């Protein structure tokens, strides 16, 4: 069990070793994407029959 | 993948012959067949077909009647019983394997063919051009013309492109428009739209020298165009 | 006098609030119920036909009951009698089936030759309905086409040898269908409780639960279709004997008449029944 | 539609009929689940899951071993929901091994099983295996070192008794279900012909319950 | 003595990890999204039901084109549907009827399924004869397959009940990589839209992004109270989804390492089943254990709508590429195509 706590140790020293963004800025880029991508979303915004392949 | 066939000979006018074709190396149950016919010195023609389970089943106008076509699935052969033989019927006639699901490539495999030889509304292929002169390196277009619209209203534009080489059997090379039929090299484009529809070569070869046929799929007499043929 | 204008109408109106509330309640077969292939077909037919019974009832209450127009009476003779019949035989027909399908899924006789009985389902039940529907219909169209003077009262309107003699044969004829399918439900069930009783198990509470549990509703059905249906059909051959000609005394027509409304008084209150002991037991008609 | 739309409705249509030809084929075909903590042999045997088909008197038989899938069981016994019936098989030898007891553990996993909210309403055959090592070892030690309140002769059929109704003694809803006992034996396939007895058993019940007549 | 001192060391790792990621938190995504215009109403409805399936829908997945989709289910059938039409276009019979998971190649050459066999079956389509053929049977795990993914035409992803997830390269029919770190049953995987690094739930509560190459797992998300189901990429790939058996959904990001938001309702007390995203992502579709569907705006934690019209658990849902049509899979061996 030594083996696996030392393994475990190095995952949990290099996932603490990393750099992080605020979460306002990522709340920011996904609202900045979703709003990009509003027009192209059939779902959000439902389209006519005649571009519609369902029906 | 082969599709061997059987009969033929010399036949009195009058009579009666049953030309019988083998099945080898595909699923034969799950495969709609053809008959497209070929006279001594003149373009392709459709004889019958015969569905999956054969429960679909049509004849030309001009073998409706006179003509019966039946499928063996158990022992992989089909069957093609014909009745009062015309100086007309006379053909190289060819078995075709054609399967329709989605995105499907029909009259992909062509059979050798077997000769026969007799003692003595519908939508018309045009093929203008015959016997264009052709140097390797080059490219060519072949036109084809439809006198009535081949796009159906689901965007599927029915127009099928065929290689006879000399000596050999039909192959085919485009399927649907702009859709390169499996193991065709990559110099083959198909482009046009309605009536209209082209085929153009990247660089013709040695082994692209032939006779170039079309076809429709819309309805169900199954029409060629007089083919154009390259010459060296 | 007091038999036919207020016996009957009291009772006819209970049944009829039953069957009415009854029929309403089963209207979740066709939503809250998905159809198949299986007798849920049967269960469906027998509904629309048990709602067709208690729409017609009204229609006999009123007429009945003294009050209301000749009109009503001469419509009774007309139209909703014979919808009211039509349905009543409808109903007999779907039991059999309902029985010779049981019959097929617990005996299991033939898995090589009872085939074309199981997905084709929906049409035996067109081919019921019409049946039934072309023998009854020729009855409308031929009542009431004799009104001259006084055809006001008696409910025999009937027009000649094409008149008169095919409700005759209409009569026979259904009750003829009745009685061969009484013969074969009585055989089926005979059957599913032999094989159900031939299951050898012991000292078990639950071989006992299912099994008592089947033989009696097997048991209530075969008891209710006997106690509703053949007192009708074994006064109505004299009653129609009696009304198709007048050589009987006057006494024999009058408890004839009053044996055909109580026997069918039972043979409509069959329609509250039919919920309880048909469609409880469905599977699917638990939700 | 097209040529080519009505060929490939052609082509659906018979595929729709090769399904429902499957189907038909497949839903008479009795679907058993084997379950064990134990004996295998000449019960199964005659990575993944193991699928054994075996016919006997014009009835075709799946029984599923599932003694090889090491992992969680709440994420894959509802796979399970349409077995015709659960053959459990414990031995009688294990009241005095330890692996908790053995016997203790079978009834824990047997208790789960029987309680299991999949299985409310399928059947459980319980074979009772090693029975001939149970009578060789049950004079020698008694039943008291597994159940402390036995209070019973230590003789073979008292002892057998006293494990079955152990065994039983642990379904909770005990109305919807039965549970099916018996000692293994080994003379002319009477295992697989209480299997089949219970087998037909539960499509007794199943049919009549589906006809509507319960 | 020393593995104390080597759980002390974790534990202080832990500490360090949990205040990183409290201090980057500042703003909640609801305060951000306060001041967005909400989605008034979804009304979704049933525009296709597909049906010849004859036992539990465990599995679908669309393709590529957004017109054919996959199907599995117990009765040991795998269908390729066209969705345009409802016309059957395969019925490839599976050697192993206890099936839980399918993919669809992004090509469409390949389909494959995995389940209770412990096997990765590749099925060719496109063939010269005109059956579908297996083209290999992946072999190495040790638990049931719960999520197979493709890379492309020779690498396939796969998540197994043995708590390993596993890259292969199908040509060569051997394990490429093998993904430790999990210490419960592995049930769900999602592929990034680069296929660079992909996301795995597993029944430990705690999701893991690992990279193809060198195999290693590069963050661990740990939110939820049960087991994780279903996971699902954001579009730009900078966020994941999750369902688990608590009743919610949480909306975790890659580069801040935290949940932003989580999707519960009072009135939901079942389980998640399957997870999808909208072509542009504010809609959250979700599967749920209650016999229907439910639409979260993303951005707001709000009920867009409801999917209903299931007779049974739904088991699998798919949002096509060009984002017009959401099909649901249910246990009642019933597809339906929404819009
Ligand atoms: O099996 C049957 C029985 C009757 N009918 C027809 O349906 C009507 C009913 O005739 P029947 O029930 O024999 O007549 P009544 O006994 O006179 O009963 C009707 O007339 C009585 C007095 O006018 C009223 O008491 C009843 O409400 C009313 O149904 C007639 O057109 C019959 O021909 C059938 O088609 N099939």
Partial sequence: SIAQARKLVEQLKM????????????????????????????????????????? | ?????????????????????????????????????????????????????????????????????????????????????????????????????????????????????????DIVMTQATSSVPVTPGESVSISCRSSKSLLHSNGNTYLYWFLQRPGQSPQLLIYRMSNLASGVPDRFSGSGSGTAFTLTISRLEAEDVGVYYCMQHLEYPLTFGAGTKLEL | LLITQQIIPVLYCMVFIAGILLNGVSGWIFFYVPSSKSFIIYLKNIVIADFVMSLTFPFKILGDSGLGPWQLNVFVCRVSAVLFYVNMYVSIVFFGLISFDRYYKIVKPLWTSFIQSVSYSKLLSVIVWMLMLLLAVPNIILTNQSVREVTQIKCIELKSELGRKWHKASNY????????????????????????????????????????????????????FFVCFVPYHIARIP??????????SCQSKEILRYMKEFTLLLSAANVCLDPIIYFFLCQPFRE | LSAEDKAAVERSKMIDRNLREDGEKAAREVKLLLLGASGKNTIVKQTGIVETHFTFKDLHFKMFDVGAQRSERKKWIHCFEGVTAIIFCVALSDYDLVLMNRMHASMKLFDSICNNKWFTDTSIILFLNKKDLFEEKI???????????????????????????????????????????????????????????????????????????? | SELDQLRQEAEQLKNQIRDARKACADATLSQITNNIDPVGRIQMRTRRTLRGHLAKIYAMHWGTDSRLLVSASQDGKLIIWDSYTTNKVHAIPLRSSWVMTCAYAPS?????????????????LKTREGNVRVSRELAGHTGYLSCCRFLDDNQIVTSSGDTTCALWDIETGQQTTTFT??????????????????????????????????????????????????????????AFATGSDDATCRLFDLRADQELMTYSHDNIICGITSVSFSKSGRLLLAGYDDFNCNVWDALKADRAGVLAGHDNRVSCLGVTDDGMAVATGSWDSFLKIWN
């Fill in chain 1, 15 to 55: 996932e603490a070793n990393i750099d992080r963004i605020k979460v306002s800025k990522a709340a920011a880029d996904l609202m900045a994407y979703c709003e990009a991508h509003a027009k192209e979303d059939p779902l959000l915004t439902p389209v006519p029959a005649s571009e519609n392949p369902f029906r």
């Fill in chain 2, 1 to 121: 993948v082969q599709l061997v066939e059987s009969g033929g000979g010399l036949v009195q006018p009058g009579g009666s012959r049953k030309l019988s074709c083998s099945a080898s190396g595909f699923a034969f149950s799950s495969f709609g067949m053809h008959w497209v016919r070929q006279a001594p010195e003149k373009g392709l023609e459709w004889v019958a077909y015969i569905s999956s389970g054969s429960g679909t089943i049509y004849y030309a106008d001009t073998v409706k009647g006179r003509f019966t076509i039946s499928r063996d699935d158990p022992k992989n052969t089909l069957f093609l019983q014909m009745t009062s033989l015309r100086s007309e019927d006379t053909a190289m006639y060819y078995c075709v394997r054609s399967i329709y699901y989605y995105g499907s490539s029909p009259f992909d495999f062509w059979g050798q063919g077997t000769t026969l030889t007799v003692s003595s509304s």
């Fill in chain 3, 173 to 224: 004829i259904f009750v003829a269908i009745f009685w061969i399918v009484f013969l074969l439900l009585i055989v089926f069930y005979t059957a599913i409780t032999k094989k159900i009783f031939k299951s050898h198990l012991k000292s078990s509470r639950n071989s006992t639960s299912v099994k008592k549990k089947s033989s009696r509703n097997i048991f209530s059905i075969v008891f209710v």
């Fill in chain 3, 239 to 248: 009653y129609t004997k009696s009304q198709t000609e007048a050589h009987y």
């Fill in chain 4, 139 to 214: 004079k020698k030690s008694p039943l008291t070192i597994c159940y402390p309140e036995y209070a019973g002769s230590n003789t073979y059929e008292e002892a057998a008794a006293y494990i079955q109704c152990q065994f039983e003694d642990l379904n909770k809803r005990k109305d919807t279900k039965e549970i099916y006992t018996h000692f293994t034996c080994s003379t002319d396939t009477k295992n697989v012909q209480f299997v089949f007895d219970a087998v037909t058993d539960v499509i007794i019940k199943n049919n009549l319950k589906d006809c509507g007549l319960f």
């Fill in chain 5, 108 to 124: 469409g050459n390949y389909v494959a399924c995995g389940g209770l066999d412990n096997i990765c079956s590749i099925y060719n």
């Fill in chain 5, 181 to 238: 770190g999990h210490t419960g049953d592995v049930m769900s995987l999602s592929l990034a839209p680069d296929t660079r690094l992909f996301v795995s739930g597993a029944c430990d509560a705690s999701a893991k992004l690992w990279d193809v190459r060198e195999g290693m797992c590069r963050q661990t998300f740990t939110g939820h109270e049960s087991d994780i189901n279903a996971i699902c990429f954001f579009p730009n790939g900078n």
